[PDB]
């Protein structure tokens, strides 16, 4: 096997070996909760808390395409309620910036729509926004498809005006993938190529339940180590549906679970790699610069 032990220390030693050249990150809502964006998983602060004001037929409807097409207003009202006062990427986001700066980042596949990867300095070429993004929006009329930046979309969201296209007056929709919509072609094109040559999978802040994103962990070669940094031990096979990640069996050979906050796990990994000062300085500098432009 490629890891000398199934620990964070073993992953760090592998990362600094000649074998580890190309890292893929798979991230979800857990990497942005410390930036103030709720996940689904938390019962106290998660998205399903405080949804009865919207009078939905069922809670999940506000994230489903068929409901959005019938009544876009609840989703835009929720977007206003959750729009953050500042966009400060987390320690975890800036750990991925270090992977980019050091030439190790092949790709970040993200389920997040909050743009924080881009704010942290990942480029479009580095990213597969598997569920799209608020970064850009488009008129929904097939004959128009006028594009609008987030500055435009934010103003429509905060004035509580359902965004309409200035050219044709159709609805303007953030470039996100609702439940029930097809994922972007870029997701499948990158998935079919990137996982031929990946040396390490870093999975952070996701429960690995939404498909087809969750299936990405099975696309790596069988020898590729997989490190999960997450509050809970996600990605294991379900004992009923099985009739995945193998952290604990007698056959376990490549999967490591670090259970805790993504910011703390990334800091711990950075420290093992000799990057702790770099990461601390980067986060403090970037946050101070964001404040200086506010």
């Amino acid at each position: 096997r490629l890891l000398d032990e199934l620990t964070l220390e073993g992953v760090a030693r592998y990362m600094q070996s000649e074998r580890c050249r190309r890292v893929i990150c798979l991230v979800g809502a857990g990497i942005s909760t410390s930036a103030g964006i709720p996940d689904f998983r938390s019962p106290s602060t998660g998205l399903y808390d405080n949804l009865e004001k919207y009078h939905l037929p069922y809670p999940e409807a506000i994230f489903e395409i068929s409901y959005f097409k019938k009544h876009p207003e609840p989703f835009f009202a929720l977007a206003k309620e959750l729009y953050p006062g500042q966009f400060k990427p987390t320690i975890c986001h800036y750990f991925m910036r270090l992977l980019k700066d050091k030439g190790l980042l092949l790709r970040c596949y993200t389920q997040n729509i909050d743009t924080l990867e881009r704010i942290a300095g990942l480029e479009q070429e580095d990213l597969v926004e598997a569920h799209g993004t608020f970064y850009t929006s488009h008129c929904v009329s097939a004959s128009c498809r006028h594009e609008y930046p987030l500055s435009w979309m934010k103003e429509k969201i905060f004035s509580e005006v359902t965004p309409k296209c200035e050219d044709c007056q159709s609805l303007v929709k953030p470039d996100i993938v609702f439940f029930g919509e097809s994922l972007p072609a870029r997701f499948f094109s990158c998935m079919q190529s990137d996982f031929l040559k990946v040396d390490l999978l870093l999975v952070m802040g996701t429960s690995l339940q939404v498909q087809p994103f969750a299936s990405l962990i099975s696309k790596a070669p069988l020898s590729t180590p997989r490190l999960l940094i997450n509050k809970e031990k996600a990605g294991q096979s379900d004992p009923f549906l099985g009739m995945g990640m193998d952290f604990d069996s007698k056959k376990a050979y490549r999967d490591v679970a670090w259970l805790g906050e993504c910011d703390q796990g990334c800091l711990a990994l950075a420290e093992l790699l000799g990057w702790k000062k770099e990461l601390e300085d980067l986060v403090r500098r970037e946050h101070a610069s964001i404040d200086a432009q506010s």
């Binding site: 029930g180 919509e181 498909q211």
Partner: peptide, 7 residues
């Protein structure tokens, strides 16, 4: 149509 987002 490409595979769809599902929970």
């Amino acid at each position: 149509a490409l595979p769809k987002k599902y929970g």
